[PDB]
Structures are given as structure tokens and as C-alpha cells.
Amino acid sequence: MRVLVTGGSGYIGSHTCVQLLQNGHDVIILDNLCNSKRSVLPVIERLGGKHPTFVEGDIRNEALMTEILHDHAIDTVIHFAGLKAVGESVQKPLEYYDNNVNGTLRLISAMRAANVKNFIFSSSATVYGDQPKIPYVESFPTGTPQSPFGKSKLMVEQILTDLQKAQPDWSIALLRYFNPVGAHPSGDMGEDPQGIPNNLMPYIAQVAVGRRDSLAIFGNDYPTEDGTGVRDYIHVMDLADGHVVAMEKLANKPGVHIYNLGAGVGNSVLDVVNAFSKACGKPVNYHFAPRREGDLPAYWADASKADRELNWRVTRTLDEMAQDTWHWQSRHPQGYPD
Amino acid sequence: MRVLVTGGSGYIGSHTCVQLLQNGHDVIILDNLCNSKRSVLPVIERLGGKHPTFVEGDIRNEALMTEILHDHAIDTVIHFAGLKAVGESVQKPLEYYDNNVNGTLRLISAMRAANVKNFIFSSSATVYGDQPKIPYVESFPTGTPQSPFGKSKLMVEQILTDLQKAQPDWSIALLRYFNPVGAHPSGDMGEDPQGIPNNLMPYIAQVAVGRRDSLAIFGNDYPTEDGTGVRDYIHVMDLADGHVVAMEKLANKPGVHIYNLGAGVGNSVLDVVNAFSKACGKPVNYHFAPRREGDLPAYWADASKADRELNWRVTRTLDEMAQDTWHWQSRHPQGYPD
Numbered sequence: 001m002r003v004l005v006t007g008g009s010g011y012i013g014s015h016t017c018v019q020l021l022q023n024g025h026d027v028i029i030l031d032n033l034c035n036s037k038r039s040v041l042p043v044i045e046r047l048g049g050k051h052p053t054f055v056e057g058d059i060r061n062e063a064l065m066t067e068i069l070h071d072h073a074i075d076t077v078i079h080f081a082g083l084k085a086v087g088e089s090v091q092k093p094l095e096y097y098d099n100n101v102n103g104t105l106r107l108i109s110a111m112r113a114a115n116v117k118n119f120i121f122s123s124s125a126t127v128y129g130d131q132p133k134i135p136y137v138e139s140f141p142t143g144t145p146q147s148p149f150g151k152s153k154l155m156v157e158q159i160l161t162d163l164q165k166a167q168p169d170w171s172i173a174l175l176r177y178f179n180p181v182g183a184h185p186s187g188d189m190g191e192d193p194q195g196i197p198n199n200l201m202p203y204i205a206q207v208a209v210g211r212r213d214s215l216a217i218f219g220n221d222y223p224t225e226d227g228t229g230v231r232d233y234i235h236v237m238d239l240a241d242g243h244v245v246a247m248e249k250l251a252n253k254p255g256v257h258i259y260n261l262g263a264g265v266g267n268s269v270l271d272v273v274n275a276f277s278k279a280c281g282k283p284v285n286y287h288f289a290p291r292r293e294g295d296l297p298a299y300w301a302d303a304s305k306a307d308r309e310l311n312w313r314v315t316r317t318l319d320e321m322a323q324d325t326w327h328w329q330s331r332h333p334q335g336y337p338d
Numbered sequence: 339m340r341v342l343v344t345g346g347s348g349y350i351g352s353h354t355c356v357q358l359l360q361n362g363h364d365v366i367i368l369d370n371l372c373n374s375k376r377s378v379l380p381v382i383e384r385l386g387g388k389h390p391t392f393v394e395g396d397i398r399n400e401a402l403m404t405e406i407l408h409d410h411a412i413d414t415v416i417h418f419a420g421l422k423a424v425g426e427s428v429q430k431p432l433e434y435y436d437n438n439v440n441g442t443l444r445l446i447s448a449m450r451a452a453n454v455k456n457f458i459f460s461s462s463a464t465v466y467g468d469q470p471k472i473p474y475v476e477s478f479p480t481g482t483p484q485s486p487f488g489k490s491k492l493m494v495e496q497i498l499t500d501l502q503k504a505q506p507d508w509s510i511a512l513l514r515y516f517n518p519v520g521a522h523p524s525g526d527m528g529e530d531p532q533g534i535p536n537n538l539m540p541y542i543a544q545v546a547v548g549r550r551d552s553l554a555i556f557g558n559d560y561p562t563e564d565g566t567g568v569r570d571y572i573h574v575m576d577l578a579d580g581h582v583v584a585m586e587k588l589a590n591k592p593g594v595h596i597y598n599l600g601a602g603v604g605n606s607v608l609d610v611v612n613a614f615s616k617a618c619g620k621p622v623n624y625h626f627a628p629r630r631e632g633d634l635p636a637y638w639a640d641a642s643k644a645d646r647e648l649n650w651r652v653t654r655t656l657d658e659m660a661q662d663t664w665h666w667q668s669r670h671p672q673g674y675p676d
């Protein structure tokens with residue numbers, strides 16, 4: 001199929017693009033490079049074993065979006081593009097709403113204009129809000145996210161829903177991601193955050209590489225087995241694979257298809273730390289700190305539905321997630337080249 | 339004060355502009371004329387007894403917004419501009435999200451840019467969602483609106499909230515309107531819907547004027563005193579006055595000030611009909627029809643808070659609302675001139 005991957009050059013997108021090419025689809029990446037570098041492109045093609053076309057641009061530019069859609073005869077769109085720093089989202093709300101809410105709205109408006117009606121959206125478990133009922137299940141009604149980032153994701157899911165309702169021929173998958181980690185097995189592709197990493201894994205990796213002193217464990221008094229926060233980590237390659245499958249099986253299948261993308265199990269902060277210590281061959285330095293604002297104690301996905309409907313489930317383990325990350329971190333301490 | 343009134347030429351805006359000028363403020367109207375005509379301008383100035391500056395333009399045009407803000411040294415912004423047809427919103431979701439959500443976002447982004455930090459937003463009781471607890475009170479948590487229109491209003495309230503949180507010097511009033519009706523006492527200004535009116539009052543008026551046959555009463559089996567839907571109708575002049583007061587008392591008073599704007603009492607469809615029959619001197623034709631999709635049985639506002647904090651409450655009655663509407667309808671059967 002002919003797919004446009006917005007945010008194609010970022011973390012999740014790049015991995016997805018490799019898997020898509022491996023499956024022989026024709027890929028067009030659209031990215032504005034605010035959070036990624038052109039250096040990843042050649043890696044994508046190498047690992048993907050096929051050439052992906054790249055277009056530097058912004059989802060907010062409807063006219064360009066429209067043109068791309070048409071120019072490449074796109075069949076489906078996978079939308080990874082947007083801003084995701086939760087804390088920053090609190091400090092800079094307008095930029096989040098603009099890039100996420102208006103950003104998607106301009107893209108789907110361009111789609112309408114070029115008659116493209118297959119969409120895949122990067123959503124998040126955050127949309128469940130403060131749900132005491134775990135694991136989280138697609139049948140649960142949504143809640144209210146605490147940050148501009150999470151609210152922006154729920155607002156988009158709502159706008160897509162309403163759109164499909166008005167244009168019933170559209171197929172729209174709302175993929176609710178859990179906690180993506182890991183990197184391509186080659187160790188030549190991976191997450192390359194700039195500045196202080198906000199997520200656990202990369203932070204741990206940076207401590208291990210010798211860049212950082214100690215990992216600050218945000219809270220040790222939660223109501224969990226070890227008292228640290230519990231989450232559903234999902235290898236980025238499993239996530240990528242899920243995106244190919246969803247795109248191939250749902251194309252032209254009208255409705256809004258919601259699926260949680262997670263391993264279906266929780267791991268605590270310590271469990272992750274221990275996994276990394278083992279991967280890197282040395283104890284990862286850490287200390288206990290106060291709870292992080294807005295953090296929920298524990299949550300993981302109920303991923304039965306994707307198993308059932310798309311015959312998709314993860315296959316990588318936590319150790320693998322840790323090992324693959326250390327391999328990428330260690331092989332490319334400076335990340336992607338300028 | 340120097341105020342920019344977006345949507346200034348529409349129903350609520352025009353009335354508000356008159357009251358604002360009467361209070362000697364300097365008004366700048368910004369409207370794109372999608373739902374209003376330039377013919378109202380001279381009426382505004384006449385009734386307002388002062389000249390308002392008019393600028394034809396779209397809230398979606400951030401650069402223009404910015405320029406206006408600066409060019410006129412605006413102190414505060416009253417934002418009435420947007421789309422409001424509930425049913426159409428279901429059929430045309432993207433246009434609603436674009437004009438309402440992106441529309442406001444572009445405006446507040448321009449404000450930020452020109453250093454304007456006083457805002458008044460036209461919100462709605464719809465944001466309360468399906469709340470069994472009536473009357474509705476500003477302390478109630480919001481719910482989930484059933485239409486793209488209502489969702490767009492709640493999404494804006496959320497984005498403004500987050501914005502104030504990030505820029506604590508901002509004063510933002512979220513004015514939740516009930517059911518605006520009526521017209522200026524002169525009978526020379528009023529609501530001028532194009533096509534089939536979606537709201538009760540104007541529809542009734544059109545039946546009375548001889549344009550329409552019968553009023554279709556959407557449902558007679560509700561759990562109300564007479565079985566017809568119950569709402570909080572509020573004269574447009576009371577609403578306008580509330581907007582002046584809120585603007586004068588809250589300017590430079592940091593926070594998010596939420597107030598319900600309603601009479602604080604409910605009236606059924608029949609009560610409104612009977613009021614109009616009396617105003618127009620003839621029985622208004624009507625018939626019972628099936629319930630309208632998405633309609634709630636009964637709801638009204640708890641407006642104690644605005645009483646208490648801004649010393650504001652309505653002063654017009656239901657009869658007045660009906661009489662003023664009939665006077666405008668009858669004096670100008672064709673509405674505003676092309």
C-alpha cells in the first residue's frame with residue numbers, strides 16, 4: 001500500500017517505517033524535524049531494505065498536506081507527528097494544542113480534500129484518565145487527562161470519532177500506546193532524545209552510559225508490590241509491527257477501531273532498573289525522590305482485543321527492551337549525527 | 339476600556355456592542371460575516387450612540403489578529419465568533435472544530451503575541467453534559483457534550499484553563515450561556531437567522547409572522563410538568579449587560595472566572611409558546627412531534643455565583659423576551675438588508 005507516515009523520522013515512526021518497507025509497502029515520510037534529524041533517513045532505508053520518500057514539512061500546513069496526499073496517491077495515513085513532553089505541555093499549552101489538535105485537524109482536513117479515508121492515530125493510555133480499574137480496557141469510558149498533552153490526545157480521538165460519524169466510509173484506528181521502549185535489534189536505530197530525557201528508560205540509559213549521576217526514582221511509597229510506580233512497557237518493534245498489521249487489516253474497513261497497544265503486564269521502576277543493570281553489566285545508580293506531579297501508581301493494558309481482532313500481541317521481553325536500548329545507547333553515545 | 343469583540347456583528351455580539359458603547363468603551367468589531375451582515379453596523383452605532391470600528395476578518399488568521407490587537411491597543415477581548423448549529427455540527431464536524439477550537443487557539447495565540455491578557459469566552463451549559471443534578475452549578479465537574487459543537491466549547495474551556503495556568507497573569511472568564519432570546523427593545527436589532535431557525539424562539543416567530551405553518555414540538559412525553567422540554571431562557575439584553583459587567587469587573591483580575599449566565603428558572607416549550615401567543619395577539623400554531631436527537635428533558639442554571647460575585651442577575655422577563663422578539667420580527671420581516 002501507499003502510506004504517508006507523519007513524524008516518520010521520530011522514535012516510533014522510524015521503527016514503523018522500517019517494518020513497513022520490509023513488508024514492501026511504499027512509504028512517504030513527512031516530518032518537520034523539530035524532534036528528529038535527517039541522519040536517520042539512510043538508516044531507515046538500510047534497515048528497511050527499501051527507499052522511503054522524505055518530505056520536510058509541517059502537518060499544520062494543510063495545502064502541502066493535500067498536495068502530498070494527491071501527489072503520492074496515498075491510500076492510508078499513519079499519524080505519529082506531534083509534541084509529547086508532558087511536563088513541557090503544562091508550561092507551554094498552546095504549542096501542544098496547536099501541534100496536536102490543530103495539527104491533526106489540518107491533516108485530516110487535507111485528507112478529506114484529497115479523498116484519503118484510512119487513518120491510524122498515535123494515541124495514549126493517558127486518555128483513560130484516573131481509572132482505578134486496571135488493566136485498562138477499550139470498553140472503559142475515557143476520563144480526563146491531567147496535562148495539556150493528554151488532553152490533546154483525547155480531544156483528537158473525539159474529533160476523529162465525530163469525523164468518522166459524518167463520513168462513515170472512513171476507517172480510523174485509535175491506537176492507545178502504553179510505554180514504548182527499546183530499539184531496533186541492530187543497535188543502529190533507537191530513541192534519541194535531546195536534552196534531559198523525560199522517560200524512565202532513556203534516563204536510565206544515560207546514567208549507565210556515564211552521562212548522568214543517579215536515577216531519581218519518583219516515589220517509593222506507592223501502593224505497589226515494591227512501592228515504586230508500575231507501568232506497561234512495550235518494545236518499540238512490537239509497537240511498529242502492530243502498526244503494520246493494523247494498517248493492513250483495517251484499510252477500507254469502516255468505523256473507529258480502538259486498540260490498546262501494550263504487553264498486558266505491569267513492571268515497576270525497580271524491575272526496569274534491575275533489567276538494565278543486567279543488560280549493561282553494572283549496577284545502575286539510583287536514588288529515591290519525591291513523587292512526580294500527576295503520576296499514577298500503577299496501570300497496564302488489557303490487550304486481549306488486539307489479540308482477538310488483529311491476531312497481534314507482543315513478542316519481545318522486558319530484558320530485550322533493556323538490552324536493545326543499551327546496544328543502541330552504547331553503539332551511538334551521541335545518537336544521530338548532525 | 340479598549341475591547342475587541344470577535345463575532346461583534348452576530349446576535350449576541352451586536353447587542354453586547356451596543357451596551358459596551360453606551361458604557362463609553364472603545365469597541366472594535368472583528369467578524370467574517372459568515373452569519374451576519376454589514377447592515378447591522380449602522381444600527382449598532384445608532385443604538386450604541388457611538389462609533390464602533392469594524393474589521394472584516396477571520397479569527398483563524400493569527401497574523402491579522404495580532405495586528406489588530408496591537409494596532410488598537412486592545413485591553414480585553416470578548417470572543418463570540420464561531421459556528422453554533424448543533425445539528426450541522428454533527429454533519430460537519432471538521433468545520434466546527436476548525437472555527438471553534440482552532441479559531442480560538444489562533445486568537446489567543448495572537449493575544450499572547452501582542453501581550454493582551456484579559457479574555458471573555460462565549461461558552462455554554464452544554465459543557466455540563468448529561469447532569470441529572472439541576473440546576474447546574476459552576477462547581478459541578480464538566481461532562482461530555484453529545485455534539486461536535488458542544489465538545490468544541492468544552493475543549494476551548496480546557497485549553498483556556500491550561501493557558502491561564504501557564505500564564506497566571508491572564509484573567510479569563512468562561513461565561514456559560516443558557517438559552518438566549520429576545521431582542522433590543524427598539525425592535526431594530528435582533529436575531530436574524532438564515533434559513534430554517536434551529537432554536538425555539540425564532541422558529542415560533544417565523545410561524546407567527548406567517549412564514550411557517552406549525553411549530554413542531556419535539557417530544558411531549560418528557561418527565562416535566564407538561565411533558566415538553568424545560569430550559570433557562572435568558573434575554574439577550576441581560577446577557578449583554580452581564581458581558582459588560584464581567585469585562586469591567588474582571589479585567590486584570592487573574593484566574594479563570596466561570597459563571598453561568600441564566601435566569602435561574604426553567605420554562606417549558608408550552609410556556610414559551612403561550613408567551614408568544616400573547617405577545618403576537620394570535621394563537622401560535624403548533625403540533626407535537628417526536629423527541630429531537632440529543633435533547634435533554636430539563637435543565638436551568640444556578641446563577642447565584644454571578645449574583646454574589648459580580649452583582650449581576652437578569653431583569654427582563656419571559657414576556658419581555660417574547661414581546662421584544664415579536665417587535666423585531668414584525669418590524670423587520672426580512673431582517674437585515676443585503
Ligand SMILES: NC(=O)c1ccc[n+]([C@@H]2O[C@H](COP(=O)([O-])OP(=O)(O)OC[C@H]3O[C@@H](n4cnc5c(N)ncnc54)[C@H](O)[C@@H]3O)[C@@H](O)[C@H]2O)c1
Nearest residue numbers: 007010011012032033034035036058059081082084122124
Ligand atoms: N514515546 C512515548 O512514550 C509516547 C506514548 C504515547 C503516545 N506517543 C505518541 O506517539 C507519536 C510518536 O511519538 P515518538 O516517541 O516517536 O516521538 P518523536 O518525537 O520521536 O516523534 C515525533 C516526530 O514528529 C515530528 N513532528 C513534531 N511536530 C510536527 C509537526 N507539527 N509537523 C511535522 N512533524 C512534526 C517530530 O519532529 C518527530 O520526528 C507522538 O504523537 C506521541 O505523542 C508516544
Ligand SMILES: NC(=O)c1ccc[n+]([C@@H]2O[C@H](COP(=O)([O-])OP(=O)(O)OC[C@H]3O[C@@H](n4cnc5c(N)ncnc54)[C@H](O)[C@@H]3O)[C@@H](O)[C@H]2O)c1
Nearest residue numbers: 345348349350370371372373374396397419420422460462
Ligand atoms: N445563541 C445561542 O443559543 C448560543 C448558546 C450558547 C453559546 N453561544 C455562543 O455565543 C457566541 C455568539 O453566538 P450568537 O447567537 O451571537 O451567534 P451568531 O452566529 O449570531 O454570531 C457569531 C458571529 O461570528 C461570526 N463568525 C463565525 N465564524 C467566524 C470566524 N471564523 N471568524 C470571524 N467571525 C466568525 C459570524 O459571522 C457571526 O457574526 C457563539 O460562540 C455561540 O457559539 C450561543
Ligand SMILES: O=c1ccn([C@@H]2O[C@H](COP(=O)(O)OP(=O)(O)O[C@H]3O[C@H](CO)[C@@H](O)[C@H](O)[C@H]3O)[C@@H](O)[C@H]2O)c(=O)[nH]1
Nearest residue numbers: 124125126177178179198199200203216217218229230295
Ligand atoms: O526519571 C524518571 C522517569 C520516570 N520515572 C517513573 O517511571 C514510570 C514511567 O515514567 P515515564 O517513562 O515518564 O512514563 P509515563 O509517565 O507512564 O508516560 C509515558 O506513557 C504514557 C502512556 O502510559 C504517555 O501518555 C506518555 O506520553 C509517556 O511519556 C513512572 O512511574 C515514573 O514515575 C522515574 O521514577 N524517574
Ligand SMILES: O=c1ccn([C@@H]2O[C@H](COP(=O)(O)OP(=O)(O)O[C@H]3O[C@H](CO)[C@@H](O)[C@H](O)[C@H]3O)[C@@H](O)[C@H]2O)c(=O)[nH]1
Nearest residue numbers: 462463464515516517536537538541554555556567568633
Ligand atoms: O423547533 C423546535 C426547536 C426547539 N424545540 C424545543 O425547545 C427547547 C429549546 O430548544 P433549542 O432552542 O434548540 O435550545 P437548546 O437545544 O436547549 O440549545 C441552545 O442552548 C444551549 C445551552 O442550553 C446551547 O448549547 C445551544 O448552542 C443552543 O442552541 C428544547 O426542549 C427543544 O426540544 C422544539 O420543540 N422545537
Ligand code: NA
Nearest residue numbers: 165166428429
Ligand atoms: Na451525517
Ligand code: NA
Nearest residue numbers: 193194195196
Ligand atoms: Na528533548
Ligand code: NA
Nearest residue numbers: 334335336337
Ligand atoms: Na546527538
Ligand code: NA
Nearest residue numbers: 090091503504
Ligand atoms: Na508554568
Ligand code: NA
Nearest residue numbers: 531532533534
Ligand atoms: Na442558518
Ligand code: NA
Nearest residue numbers: 672673674675
Ligand atoms: Na433577510
